[PDB]
Design an enzyme around this catalytic site. Sequence first.
Site, PDB file in Angstrom:
ATOM      1  N   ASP A   1      12.576 -12.180  -1.055  1.00  0.00           N
ATOM      2  CA  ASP A   1      12.160 -12.081   0.333  1.00  0.00           C
ATOM      3  C   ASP A   1      13.586 -11.516   0.916  1.00  0.00           C
ATOM      4  O   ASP A   1      14.917 -11.836   0.673  1.00  0.00           O
ATOM      5  CB  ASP A   1      12.094 -13.513   0.899  1.00  0.00           C
ATOM      6  CG  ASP A   1      11.311 -13.470   2.138  1.00  0.00           C
ATOM      7  OD1 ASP A   1      11.924 -12.678   3.056  1.00  0.00           O
ATOM      8  OD2 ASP A   1      10.204 -13.904   2.137  1.00  0.00           O
ATOM      9  N   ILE A   2      13.414 -10.445   1.663  1.00  0.00           N
ATOM     10  CA  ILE A   2      14.456  -9.916   2.278  1.00  0.00           C
ATOM     11  C   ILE A   2      15.146 -10.837   3.146  1.00  0.00           C
ATOM     12  O   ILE A   2      16.371 -10.623   3.906  1.00  0.00           O
ATOM     13  CB  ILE A   2      14.196  -8.688   3.187  1.00  0.00           C
ATOM     14  CG1 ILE A   2      13.259  -8.984   4.228  1.00  0.00           C
ATOM     15  CG2 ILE A   2      13.716  -7.362   2.269  1.00  0.00           C
ATOM     16  CD1 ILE A   2      12.847  -7.780   5.157  1.00  0.00           C
TER      17      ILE A   2
ATOM     18  N   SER B   1       6.997   3.648  12.934  1.00  0.00           N
ATOM     19  CA  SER B   1       5.638   3.769  13.212  1.00  0.00           C
ATOM     20  C   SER B   1       5.588   4.678  14.630  1.00  0.00           C
ATOM     21  O   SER B   1       6.356   4.512  15.403  1.00  0.00           O
ATOM     22  CB  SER B   1       4.858   2.458  13.698  1.00  0.00           C
ATOM     23  OG  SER B   1       3.744   2.562  14.425  1.00  0.00           O
TER      24      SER B   1
ATOM     25  N   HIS C   1       4.056 -11.450  -0.116  1.00  0.00           N
ATOM     26  CA  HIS C   1       3.348 -12.003   1.075  1.00  0.00           C
ATOM     27  C   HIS C   1       1.845 -11.286   1.335  1.00  0.00           C
ATOM     28  O   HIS C   1       0.994 -11.931   1.960  1.00  0.00           O
ATOM     29  CB  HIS C   1       4.163 -11.614   2.301  1.00  0.00           C
ATOM     30  CG  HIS C   1       3.356 -11.799   3.741  1.00  0.00           C
ATOM     31  ND1 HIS C   1       3.210 -12.953   4.322  1.00  0.00           N
ATOM     32  CD2 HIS C   1       2.749 -11.024   4.577  1.00  0.00           C
ATOM     33  CE1 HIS C   1       2.582 -12.961   5.249  1.00  0.00           C
ATOM     34  NE2 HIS C   1       2.072 -11.525   5.449  1.00  0.00           N
TER      35      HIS C   1
ATOM     36  N   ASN D   1     -19.236   0.220  15.205  1.00  0.00           N
ATOM     37  CA  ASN D   1     -19.164   0.031  16.598  1.00  0.00           C
ATOM     38  C   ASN D   1     -18.044   1.242  16.907  1.00  0.00           C
ATOM     39  O   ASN D   1     -16.959   1.340  16.459  1.00  0.00           O
ATOM     40  CB  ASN D   1     -18.594  -1.427  16.965  1.00  0.00           C
ATOM     41  CG  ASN D   1     -19.862  -2.009  17.305  1.00  0.00           C
ATOM     42  OD1 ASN D   1     -20.898  -1.820  16.748  1.00  0.00           O
ATOM     43  ND2 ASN D   1     -19.562  -3.288  17.733  1.00  0.00           N
TER      44      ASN D   1
ATOM     45  N   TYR E   1       4.762   7.737  11.818  1.00  0.00           N
ATOM     46  CA  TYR E   1       3.531   7.998  11.443  1.00  0.00           C
ATOM     47  C   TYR E   1       2.625   7.279  12.014  1.00  0.00           C
ATOM     48  O   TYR E   1       2.858   6.056  12.334  1.00  0.00           O
ATOM     49  CB  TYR E   1       3.122   8.328  10.010  1.00  0.00           C
ATOM     50  CG  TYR E   1       3.739   7.035   9.110  1.00  0.00           C
ATOM     51  CD1 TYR E   1       4.952   6.818   9.001  1.00  0.00           C
ATOM     52  CD2 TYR E   1       2.712   6.305   8.904  1.00  0.00           C
ATOM     53  CE1 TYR E   1       5.395   5.631   8.137  1.00  0.00           C
ATOM     54  CE2 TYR E   1       3.200   4.731   8.190  1.00  0.00           C
ATOM     55  CZ  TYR E   1       4.560   4.878   8.067  1.00  0.00           C
ATOM     56  OH  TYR E   1       4.765   3.595   7.087  1.00  0.00           O
TER      57      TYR E   1
ATOM     58  N   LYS F   1       9.104  -2.643  15.649  1.00  0.00           N
ATOM     59  CA  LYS F   1       9.377  -1.257  14.965  1.00  0.00           C
ATOM     60  C   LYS F   1      10.308  -0.213  15.900  1.00  0.00           C
ATOM     61  O   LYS F   1      11.370   0.140  15.289  1.00  0.00           O
ATOM     62  CB  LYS F   1       8.077  -0.510  14.673  1.00  0.00           C
ATOM     63  CG  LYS F   1       7.211  -0.899  13.908  1.00  0.00           C
ATOM     64  CD  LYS F   1       7.695  -1.164  12.461  1.00  0.00           C
ATOM     65  CE  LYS F   1       7.864  -0.266  11.626  1.00  0.00           C
ATOM     66  NZ  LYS F   1       8.201  -0.656  10.109  1.00  0.00           N
TER      67      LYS F   1
ATOM     68  N   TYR G   1       0.887  -1.221   0.017  1.00  0.00           N
ATOM     69  CA  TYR G   1       0.232  -0.060  -0.032  1.00  0.00           C
ATOM     70  C   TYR G   1       0.716   1.092  -0.033  1.00  0.00           C
ATOM     71  O   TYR G   1       0.667   2.133  -0.932  1.00  0.00           O
ATOM     72  CB  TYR G   1      -0.965  -0.168   1.376  1.00  0.00           C
ATOM     73  CG  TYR G   1      -1.753   1.214   1.454  1.00  0.00           C
ATOM     74  CD1 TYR G   1      -2.427   1.981   0.377  1.00  0.00           C
ATOM     75  CD2 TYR G   1      -1.938   1.590   2.810  1.00  0.00           C
ATOM     76  CE1 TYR G   1      -3.140   2.976   0.614  1.00  0.00           C
ATOM     77  CE2 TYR G   1      -2.751   2.457   3.209  1.00  0.00           C
ATOM     78  CZ  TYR G   1      -3.389   3.506   1.885  1.00  0.00           C
ATOM     79  OH  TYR G   1      -4.211   4.466   2.345  1.00  0.00           O
TER      80      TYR G   1
ATOM     81  N   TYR H   1       4.245  -5.988  17.092  1.00  0.00           N
ATOM     82  CA  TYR H   1       4.647  -5.236  16.111  1.00  0.00           C
ATOM     83  C   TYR H   1       5.379  -3.896  16.384  1.00  0.00           C
ATOM     84  O   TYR H   1       6.200  -3.684  16.150  1.00  0.00           O
ATOM     85  CB  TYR H   1       3.264  -4.914  15.250  1.00  0.00           C
ATOM     86  CG  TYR H   1       3.483  -3.757  14.315  1.00  0.00           C
ATOM     87  CD1 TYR H   1       4.108  -4.097  13.033  1.00  0.00           C
ATOM     88  CD2 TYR H   1       3.146  -2.523  14.671  1.00  0.00           C
ATOM     89  CE1 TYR H   1       4.459  -2.909  12.113  1.00  0.00           C
ATOM     90  CE2 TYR H   1       3.306  -1.554  13.544  1.00  0.00           C
ATOM     91  CZ  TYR H   1       4.189  -1.628  12.577  1.00  0.00           C
ATOM     92  OH  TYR H   1       4.028  -0.562  11.349  1.00  0.00           O
TER      93      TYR H   1
END
Lengths: 344, 344
Positions: free
Chosen positions: B66-67, B132, B38, B224, B185, B161, B15, B157
Site C-alpha cells: 500500500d502506498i 484527470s 483494492h 438510458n 484525460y 486530482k 486497468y 475525486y
Amino acid sequence: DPMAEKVLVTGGAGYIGSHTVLELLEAGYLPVVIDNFHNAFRGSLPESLRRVQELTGRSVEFEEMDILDQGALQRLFKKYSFMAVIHFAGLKAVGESVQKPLDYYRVNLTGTIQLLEIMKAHGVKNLVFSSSATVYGNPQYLPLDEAHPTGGCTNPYGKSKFFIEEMIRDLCQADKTWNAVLLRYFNPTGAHASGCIGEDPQGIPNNLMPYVSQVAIGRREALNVFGNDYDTEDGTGVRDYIHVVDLAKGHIAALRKLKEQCGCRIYNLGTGTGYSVLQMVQAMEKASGKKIPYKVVARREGDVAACYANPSLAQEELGWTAALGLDRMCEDLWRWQKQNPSGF
Amino acid sequence: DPMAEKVLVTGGAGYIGSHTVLELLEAGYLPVVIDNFHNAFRGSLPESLRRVQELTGRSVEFEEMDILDQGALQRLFKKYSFMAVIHFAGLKAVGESVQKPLDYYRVNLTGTIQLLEIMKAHGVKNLVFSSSATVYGNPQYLPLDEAHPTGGCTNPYGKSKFFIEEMIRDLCQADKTWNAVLLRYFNPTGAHASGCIGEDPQGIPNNLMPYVSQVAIGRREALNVFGNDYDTEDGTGVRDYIHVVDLAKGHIAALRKLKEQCGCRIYNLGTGTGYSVLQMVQAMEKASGKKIPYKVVARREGDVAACYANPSLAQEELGWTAALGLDRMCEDLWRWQKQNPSGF
Ligand SMILES: NC(=O)C1=CN([C@@H]2O[C@H](COP(=O)(O)OP(=O)(O)OC[C@H]3O[C@@H](n4cnc5c(N)ncnc54)[C@H](O)[C@@H]3O)[C@@H](O)[C@H]2O)C=CC1
Ligand SMILES: NC(=O)C1=CN([C@@H]2O[C@H](COP(=O)(O)OP(=O)(O)OC[C@H]3O[C@@H](n4cnc5c(N)ncnc54)[C@H](O)[C@@H]3O)[C@@H](O)[C@H]2O)C=CC1
Ligand SMILES: *S(=O)(=O)c1cccc(CNC(=O)Nc2cc(C3CCC3)on2)c1
Ligand SMILES: *S(=O)(=O)c1cccc(CNC(=O)Nc2cc(C3CCC3)on2)c1
C-alpha cells in the site's frame, strides 16, 4: 455530564490557540491542549499556557504530541471525553510555504485527515476549523462575503487551507451528523490586555504589525511601504486585521454553534473595516509614543489595493462582533512587546 | 547502467496501469509494479499482470503493498533502483467519492504525499502523474486546452486530482531539479487488442461504455440517454473517450520527456474529437453486431452539452497522437467482454 466534557484545542500553545484557551477557561469550558512545540516555546506546560493558567487561576490540561502521530491521537481520544475539537495545529507562514510546500501539505492535509478520522471513529463529529480568508484569493468585489468565490490562491499555505475546507465540506455532505464551523479571517494582531501573552517572534511574519512595532522600539530603522498610489483613501494598500482576543471569542462562538446541530457552516471573522499601511503606522505611533519612519518603495506586482472581509453573517448567526479596533490592537501589541521584548 | 534501471508503476495491476506495464515491456523498459489489490483481481501476480507476462513473453516484477505504508515504501526504494515513477495508485470512482470522501482524500492525497516524500529522499525526482481532465470543471470554451482554468470540479475525486496536481506544481517550483509530467484525460475505454486484458467490472462505473456493451450482450435491456435536445450535432451529449492503449503509450511518452529535465509539464491526452451518446451506441452496434436499445430520459441538471480535450500540445512536445478511434475502442472492448464475460 455534558458540561464536564472537554474541548480539544490542537495547536493550543501557539498565538491564536493560547488566547483561545484563555477565552475557553474564562467562558467556563474545560480545554485539553495538544501541541508538538514546532512553533511554541517550552515548566511542564508551554510557557504561553503556563501564563494562561496564572492569568485565569484555572488549570490547562496539556499533552505534547503531533497530529501526525496516529497512535497518540488514539490514546488521546480514549483518555479524554471530548465534546468538540478546535483545530489550530498546522504550519502557517505564507512565505515559508513557498520554499517547503511538502511540509505544509503533509502537516496541514495529512494531519487534518488523521484528526478527522479519529474524530469520526470516536463519535466526536463536532469541529471548529480555524481557516484563512486567503481562500477567497484576489477580491472580485469588496467587502469579501461568504458567497465570494474561493480557490484562487497561489501560495501553498493558502491552497492547503482551501483544500482542508473542501475536505470538511465533503465530509459533512456525506455524513449529515457532522457539525463543522469554518472560520475565515485575515491577519491576527494585538495580544491579551495583560501583556503577559502575545505572538512570539516569528521566523517569516505574515503581516507588518510586528515590523511596525519593531521600528517603534528602535530595532529597525523604517517600514518599507510597497506603493503609495493605490486607489485608496490615502494611496497605501488596505488590509484586514483582527484583534486576537476578538478572534479567540469568535472560536468560542463557533463552538456554541455546534450545539445547534448546524451541519457545515462558514463565517468570516473581522472588524469590517480595512486599514491602510499609513493608518497602521499612525496608530502604532499613537500607541507607542514613538516616531515610525517609513520609506515608500515601488508597488509589488500582484498586490491588490484593498482586501477585507464582511463579518455580517457571523453577527447574524453567531451573535459575534469584533469589539476591539485598530487603536486597541496597537496598544495591546505594544504592551506585549514592551513587557516581553524577545517573547516568552 | 541507466537502461537497466527500473520504472516503478504504482497501481500497476489496475486497468490503465496493466496496459501501461504491457507498453513499457514492449518499449524495452523494466517495470516494477506495486498494488494493494483494492481494485484488482488476485498465481503470484495479479491476474492482469500474469496475462501481460504471457502476452509479452517478459517478466513483471511485483510487490503487494500500500502506498500508505511508509515502511514498505522505504523497503521498496532501497531494494530497487528506480529511474522514475508512474503513479496510478488511487481511488477513482467518481460516484463513490461522494459517499466516502475521506477515503478518497486519505488514499489519494496522503498516499501521494508519502510517495513524493520517499521519491525525494531517494533522489528519484522524476514523476509521471496520471491525472484527470475533470480538473478543468465545466468547459468555459472547447476544446479544453492546458490554458483553460482548473479547480472548478465539485466532486471529491476530481478535487483530489486537482489538489495533487497543485502539490506537484508547488514542489517543482520549490525544487527545480524535479521533473514531473501531469497527464490529463477523460474516459479510458477499449482494451488490448488480444482481448486477454481489459477493465474488470467496476462497482460504480465512470462512463457508459461498459453499460452499452452490457446491453449489447443482453445483460441489460436498454441504455438510458439523459437528454436528447442538447445543442450538439445529434442532440445527445458529447463526451471524451480515449483508447486505453493510446493512453498507456502517452504515459511512456511522458516517461521519455522526463529525460529532458523538463521540470513540471502538463499535457492533455485524447483524440481531439468528442463522441455523442448516440454515436457511441451506433459504434457499439457495429462492433458487436447487436441492436442496442436506448431510452431517452430527461436531462440531468448540471450536465453540459459537450466536453472534450485538445491534445495538440502533447503532439508538439511528446510526439504523441492517439491512433485508435471510436470504432477500435468498441471493437476492442467487445472482444475483451466476449472473451472474459465477468472479467478476470
Ligand atoms: N497567523 C496567521 O496569519 C493566521 C493563522 N491562521 C490559522 O491559525 C492556526 C494557528 O495559527 P497561529 O496561532 O497563528 O500560529 P502558531 O504557529 O502560533 O500556532 C500553531 C501551533 O500549532 C502547533 N503545531 C504545528 N504543527 C503541529 C503538529 N504537527 N502537531 C501538533 N501541533 C502542531 C505549533 O507548534 C503552534 O503552537 C493555523 O490553523 C493557521 O492556519 C489563519 C489565518 C491567519
Ligand atoms: N478510470 C478513469 O475513469 C480514470 C482514471 N484516472 C486515473 O488513473 C489511475 C488508475 O485508474 P484506473 O486504471 O482507471 O483504475 P484501477 O482502480 O483499475 O487502478 C488503480 C489501481 O490502484 C490500486 N490501488 C488503490 N489504492 C491503492 C493503494 N493505497 N496502494 C496501492 N495500490 C492501490 C488498485 O488496486 C488498482 O489496481 C488513478 O490515478 C485515476 O485517478 C484518471 C482519469 C480517468
Ligand atoms: S524593511 O523595511 O526593510 C521590510 C522589508 C519587507 C517587508 C516589510 C514590511 N512592510 C510591508 O509589508 N509594507 C507593505 C505591505 C503592503 C501591502 C498593502 C499593499 C501591499 O504595502 N506596504 C518591511
Ligand atoms: S440503465 O439504463 O438504467 C442506466 C442508469 C444510469 C446510467 C446509465 C448509463 N447511461 C448514461 O450514462 N447515459 C448518458 C450519459 C450522458 C451524458 C452526455 C450528456 C450527459 O447522457 N446520457 C444507464
